[PDB]
Design an enzyme around this catalytic site. Structure first.
Site, PDB file in Angstrom:
ATOM      1  N   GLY A  78      68.221  17.081  45.512  1.00  0.00           N
ATOM      2  CA  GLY A  78      67.769  16.317  44.412  1.00  0.00           C
ATOM      3  C   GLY A  78      67.749  14.841  44.549  1.00  0.00           C
ATOM      4  N   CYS A  89      35.538  19.623  38.776  1.00  0.00           N
ATOM      5  CA  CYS A  89      34.991  19.698  37.459  1.00  0.00           C
ATOM      6  C   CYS A  89      36.098  19.975  36.464  1.00  0.00           C
ATOM      7  CB  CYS A  89      34.025  20.826  37.550  1.00  0.00           C
ATOM      8  SG  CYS A  89      33.037  21.078  36.179  1.00  0.00           S
ATOM      9  N   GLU A  90      37.148  19.152  36.536  1.00  0.00           N
ATOM     10  CA  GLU A  90      38.298  19.288  35.647  1.00  0.00           C
ATOM     11  C   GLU A  90      38.726  17.906  35.123  1.00  0.00           C
ATOM     12  OE1 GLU A  90      41.065  21.272  33.417  1.00  0.00           O
ATOM     13  OE2 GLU A  90      39.793  22.370  34.836  1.00  0.00           O
ATOM     14  N   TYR A 122      56.211  18.701  48.304  1.00  0.00           N
ATOM     15  CA  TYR A 122      55.487  19.295  47.104  1.00  0.00           C
ATOM     16  C   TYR A 122      54.021  18.833  47.075  1.00  0.00           C
ATOM     17  CZ  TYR A 122      60.463  19.805  46.201  1.00  0.00           C
ATOM     18  OH  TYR A 122      61.751  20.224  46.381  1.00  0.00           O
ATOM     19  N   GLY A 166      65.332  18.327  50.152  1.00  0.00           N
ATOM     20  CA  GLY A 166      63.910  18.545  50.462  1.00  0.00           C
ATOM     21  C   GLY A 166      63.171  17.211  50.405  1.00  0.00           C
ATOM     22  N   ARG A 167      62.841  16.785  49.201  1.00  0.00           N
ATOM     23  CA  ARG A 167      61.997  15.590  48.992  1.00  0.00           C
ATOM     24  C   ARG A 167      62.461  14.348  49.776  1.00  0.00           C
ATOM     25  NH1 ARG A 167      59.187  14.952  44.235  1.00  0.00           N
ATOM     26  NH2 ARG A 167      60.754  16.313  43.204  1.00  0.00           N
TER      27      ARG A 167
END
Ligand code: PLP
EC number: 4.1.1.20
Length: 385
Positions: free
Chosen positions: A213, A313-314, A342, A247-248
């Site tokens: 974290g 197209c969002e 991520y 991780g990050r």
């Protein structure tokens, strides 16, 4: 030139990782814990490319895995099974038998119900850690606190006694705590860990897994490693083994996302720099709203204000909102920083798009493709006609 080098050879959208950064950040994490009997692991959920996981294994990291799929990435990276930690709130008996056949022996148990299934198997050699959720001062880090009171993981730390009453005599070696993600303040860690370490001492556990974290600098925040080493590490020194699951903090800074500008659309006051990948490549900005700094390869300046948007197209297919940039032109390359975590792992095929390539710039300077580019046929690879 290095980043443009990669775009010239491999095209875009392409994530580009730097081996040098991955090794330095992994060494940085280990150094914070000097004095502690550390077993460092990398959270595979942040990046599952085995070529990058091999680098982390070389740096002495085991792997925190959740699924069969994560366990296979570890295997592809030549990670010894005794350095794998298995997390998860939905471990099935089928999965457990599979993990046991692979000689995984460290399990962070999420619930009473999971533990009852482990007893029906009663494997030998497995070390269990119980995931607990310490109460964290509600008025100060209100975001970490309600997550650790309402999220689906672990058991409340106040219920540890109720768990130990039922399961005493199983090979329970310690507690596991993971309080959140993208945390750049030290105090939440000190608060949660002091409670978990106190609880560990009441039971005399000799190991502990303190999760991960650690946050990174996306837009100016930074986790003060001096303060962390001074306030958190000393409490950890008693243990025969301390496991961390990062991780990050390790992989995010190692990666950039490269996108080519298709057109620059002007609408009066505003400008939309349209690039060749959007939320199908990097979903963070539209799902989490996280801020990634961006820049244009080979150009510096502040004469244009623009949103950088994808070709889908969002409505929220946006990479970056309202940024000052040099005068962008079609064919320019936009680099998105801190794209190594991520990032690819959340890429998808929305609007029948193809997933990006990944490339590794090695320390010796060699540029290696580590993830080819999905073709259009790949999109329909699993259709059964
Ligand atoms: C149990 C566990 N440990 C560690 C980590 C991740 O932390 P980060 O990438 O913030 O370090 C995760 C992320 O989901 C996790 O669920």
């Amino acid at each position: 030139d290095i980043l443009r080098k990669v775009a010239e050879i491999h095209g875009t959208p392409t994530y580009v990782y730097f081996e040098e950064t991955l090794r330095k950040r992994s060494r940085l994490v280990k150094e914070v814990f000097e004095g502690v009997n550390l077993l460092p692991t990398f959270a595979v959920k942040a990046n599952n490319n085995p070529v990058l996981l091999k680098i982390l294994r070389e740096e002495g990291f085991g792997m925190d895995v959740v699924t069969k799929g994560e366990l296979l990435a570890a295997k592809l990276a030549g990670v010894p099974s005794h350095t794998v930690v298995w997390n998860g709130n939905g471990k099935s008996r089928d999965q457990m038998e599979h993990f046991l056949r692979e000689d995984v022996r460290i399990v962070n148990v999420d619930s009473f119900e999971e533990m009852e299934i482990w007893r029906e198997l009663n494997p030998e050699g497995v070390e269990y850690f119980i995931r607990v959720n310490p109460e964290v001062d509600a008025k100060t880090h209100p975001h970490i606190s309600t997550g650790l009171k309402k999220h689906k993981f672990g058991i409340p730390l106040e219920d540890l006694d109720s768990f130990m009453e039922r399961f005493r005599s199983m090979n329970i070696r310690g507690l596991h705590v993971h309080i959140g993600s993208q945390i750049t303040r030290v105090e939440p860690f000190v608060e949660a860990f002091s409670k978990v370490v106190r609880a560990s001492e009441r039971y005399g556990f000799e190991e502990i897994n303190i999760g991960g974290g650690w946050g990174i600098n996306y837009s100016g925040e930074e986790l003060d490693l001096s303060s962390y080493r001074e306030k958190v590490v000393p409490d950890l020194k008693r243990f025969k083994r301390v496991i961390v699951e990062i991780g990050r903090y390790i992989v995010a800074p190692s990666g950039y996302l490269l996108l080519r500008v298709v057109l620059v659309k002007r609408r009066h006051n505003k400008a939309f720099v349209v690039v060749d990948g959007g939320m199908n490549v990097l979903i963070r900005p539209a799902l989490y709203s996280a801020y990634h700094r961006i820049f244009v390869l080979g150009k510096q300046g502040k004469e244009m204000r623009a949103d950088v948007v994808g070709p889908l197209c969002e409505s929220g297919d946006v990479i970056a909102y309202d940024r000052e940039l040099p005068e962008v032109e079609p064919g320019d390359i936009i680099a998105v920083e801190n794209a190594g975590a991520y990032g690819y792992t959340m890429s998808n095929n929305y609007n029948s798009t193809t997933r990006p390539a990944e490339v590794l710039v090695r320390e010796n300077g060699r540029i290696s493709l580590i993830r080819r580019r999905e073709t259009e046929m790949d999109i329909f690879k699993d259709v059964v006609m």
